[PDB]
Amino acid sequence: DVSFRLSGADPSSYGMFIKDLRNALPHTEKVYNIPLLLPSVSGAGRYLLMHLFNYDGNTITVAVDVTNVYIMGYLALTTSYFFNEPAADLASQYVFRSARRKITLPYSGNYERLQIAAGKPREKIPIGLPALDTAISTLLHYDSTAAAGALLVLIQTTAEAARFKYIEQQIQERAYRDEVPSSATISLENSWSGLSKQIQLAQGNNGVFRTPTVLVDSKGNRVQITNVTSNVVTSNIQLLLNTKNI
Numbered sequence: 001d002v003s004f005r006l007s008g009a010d011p012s013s014y015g016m017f018i019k020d021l022r023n024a025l026p027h028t029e030k031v032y033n034i035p036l037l038l039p040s041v042s043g044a045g046r047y048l049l050m051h052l053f054n055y056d057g058n059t060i061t062v063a064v065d066v067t068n069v070y071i072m073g074y075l076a077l078t079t080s081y082f083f084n085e086p087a088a089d090l091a092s093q094y095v096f097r098s099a100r101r102k103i104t105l106p107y108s109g110n111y112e113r114l115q116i117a118a119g120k121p122r123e124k125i126p127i128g129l130p131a132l133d134t135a136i137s138t139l140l141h142y143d144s145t146a147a148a149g150a151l152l153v154l155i156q157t158t159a160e161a162a163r164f165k166y167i168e169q170q171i172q173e174r175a176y177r178d179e180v181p182s183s184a185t186i187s188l189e190n191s192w193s194g195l196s197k198q199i200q201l202a203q204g205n206n207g208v209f210r211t212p213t214v215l216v217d218s219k220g221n222r223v224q225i226t227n228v229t230s231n232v233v234t235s236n237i238q239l240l241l242n243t244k245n246i
């Protein structure tokens with residue numbers, strides 16, 4: 001398991017968390033020096049438990065699918081909650097079985113559905129360490145509309161930061177003041193699958209992508225990534241979704 005406490009948190013302790021989260025995900029190969037997540041993992045070992053504590057010391061445990069860094073659900077006191085999707089229903093066979101009751105949330109976990117439920121796109125939802133503390137707090141008691149927003153924060157500040165050093169840095173810069181994500185951050189989130197695929201297809205193609213990936217950069221300019229020499233590949237991306245899952 002991995003843990004993160006908001007009480008006393010700073011950029012360093014957050015970076016240690018995100019490093020622990022990355023290191024907890026299994027891999028047997030690197031591709032261009034980036035860990036390649038596994039095609040599949042059977043049974044319970046498929047799910048990492050993240051223990052998150054708000055500033056007051058209250059806690060939820062979040063279940064994460066180690067093949068794709070997808071959050072499946074969470075435990076808050078004696079109630080478990082899972083996304084309304086088959087992968088989460090499967091996860092509920094393995095994690096938090098000791099919950100006194102299990103609630104299926106009224107949406108799946110993908111960004112489009114969560115934004116619909118929350119009533120706003122994630123361009124408009126501030127993220128940061130304060131936002132994470134609020135998210136955890138919200139998730140402690142069921143409210144499905146409030147939870148959608150909370151989960152959009154939680155996904156970005158855990159999984160998406162594990163995937164991209166740039167995103168991890170963006171949260172660090174919001175350690176004490178929330179701010180909506182940069183467009184670059186949004187772009188990288190949306191491109192993770194595509195990037196992961198193209199980096200893998202590059203291996204038998206002399207480091208060249210079969211299909212260019214369009215990102216937004218730090219300055220809000222849209223740019224094409226065509227090969228493994230790009231800083232998105234050498235510096236930024238930390239985890240690859242296996243092509244078998246794409």
Ligand SMILES: Nc1ccn([C@@H]2O[C@H](COP(=O)(O)OP(=O)(O)O)[C@@H](O)[C@H]2O)c(=O)n1
Nearest residue numbers: 069070071072083109110111112113155159
């Ligand atoms: N059950 C789920 C589903 C998605 N997600 C997250 O949402 C991201 C986007 O999934 P997607 O590409 O299907 O989202 P949409 O923009 O298509 O709605 C994933 O890469 C995960 O970071 C999650 O944490 N748990």
Ligand SMILES: *[C@@H]1O[C@H](CO)[C@@H](O)[C@H](O)[C@H]1NC(C)=O
Nearest residue numbers: 208225226227228229230231
């Ligand atoms: C490869 O990417 C680098 C870095 O972005 C770029 O300057 C170069 O023009 C690209 N070359 C090819 C052959 O795709």
